[PDB]
Design a protein around this ligand. Structure first.
Ligand SMILES: CC(=O)SCCNC(=O)CCNC(=O)[C@H](O)C(C)(C)COP(=O)(O)OP(=O)(O)OC[C@H]1O[C@@H](n2cnc3c(N)ncnc32)[C@H](O)[C@@H]1OP(=O)(O)O
Ligand SMILES: CC(=O)SCCNC(=O)CCNC(=O)[C@H](O)C(C)(C)COP(=O)(O)OP(=O)(O)OC[C@H]1O[C@@H](n2cnc3c(N)ncnc32)[C@H](O)[C@@H]1OP(=O)(O)O
Ligand SMILES: Clc1ccccc1-c1nnc[nH]1
Lengths: 164, 164
């Protein structure tokens, strides 16, 4: 239940080197249910009650796709998840090339503005580079553009949406 | 080898109703190697030589992920693929919700400006709706924004990119 979602060898040594004392960034593991992962997600959207059975099934589902869905967490060294982010690696049918997609970055409100979001993005960029992505992309609002600029991203196009 | 990538029941009846005579939109199948699929892709990027062995292996790879990677084609009714597009369905770890991502839309140059790109997008939107996506998103350049506006998309944010 402490078996990481993906290899810890995919975590940037340079990011680990600059985290606050006792903090770590690491792959999700199944035991993170107990470390307040869903609480960090509540920064992003309303989540809902989820029980350990459901968590365990959703964890086996993502683990079946661990060559695509890279979920990592920032742990405060006291058993509390305080940040998360996702890299989804799109393996094309670019001479069969690969694009990383950054998704669902969240930092607990009380821990915001301490570079933990930057560290999460640096870590997801390092995963994507390591697995052979030529680029990482993400969609953002006009309001958090300046966050992604500080993380070394540049405007590349427009996000278009269609609602049902 | 005529076994479709995904169920033909996911193809919009309304789109099939308005295609030019003898044209169809349908899931990719393994035999599409022989119908000039790679030629349509050359509208998007430079592809390279790929042999039938490689095609067959890449086809089994996508078929293993046919709950995520929905590739469809426009067939002219004379054995020629003249358009393609992809829907990638992102199943979240939104109360475990789903986002469609439209990718790699291409229409052969000689068949452009006849509504085949619109039909491809309408068809991919219908797949996403049917499988339970709350929204479909895509990234585009400023130059083809007006194409997506005509297909019923609206600007929703910015695409940011990070190169290696
Ligand atoms: C692709 C997606 O994930 S979109 C969803 C993004 N997530 C959310 O909107 C959820 C709510 N917000 C958050 O969780 C956080 O505020 C995040 C993840 C956006 C940013 O994380 P934080 O830990 O707060 O930011 P962090 O301190 O790492 O920011 C790095 C730098 O960007 C700055 N910054 C942070 N947010 C913003 C912003 N919205 N606009 C401009 N600058 C910003 C920080 O002040 C810091 O600047 P510095 O280098 O000059 O110190
Ligand atoms: C998310 C992604 O896939 S990004 C990659 C997009 N693909 C490419 O750039 C590859 C090259 N381009 C193409 O293959 C095609 O031109 C496509 C797929 C962009 C559009 O396909 P087409 O079949 O040419 O367009 P289609 O005739 O369906 O266009 C529908 C309407 O939009 C119009 N239109 C098409 N392209 C554009 C454009 N770039 N700007 C504004 N309007 C456009 C058409 O004239 C038509 O207008 P109407 O309803 O008034 O007749
Ligand atoms: Cl294409 C895409 C775009 C944005 C977010 C995720 C995806 C994806 N899901 N599986 C593979 N790729």
């Amino acid at each position: 239940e402490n078996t990481p979602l993906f290899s810890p060898s995919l975590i940037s040594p340079d990011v680990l080197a600059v985290l606050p004392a006792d903090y770590t960034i690491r792959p999700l593991c199944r035991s993170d249910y107990k470390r307040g992962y869903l609480d960090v997600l509540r920064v992003l959207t309303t989540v809902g009650d989820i029980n350990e059975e459901q968590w365990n099934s959703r964890y086996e589902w993502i683990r079946a796709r661990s060559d695509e869905y890279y979920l990592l967490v920032v742990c405060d060294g006291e058993g509390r998840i305080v940040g998360t982010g996702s890299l989804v690696v799109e393996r094309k049918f670019h001479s069969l090339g690969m694009v990383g997609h950054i998704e669902d970055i969240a930092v607990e409100k009380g821990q915001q503005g301490k570079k933990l979001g930057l560290r999460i993005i640096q870590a997801l960029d390092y995963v994507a580079e390591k697995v052979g992505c030529y680029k990482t992309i993400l969609d953002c609002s006009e309001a958090n553009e300046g966050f992604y600029i500080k993380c070394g991203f540049k405007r590349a196009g427009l996000e278009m949406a269609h609602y049902y």
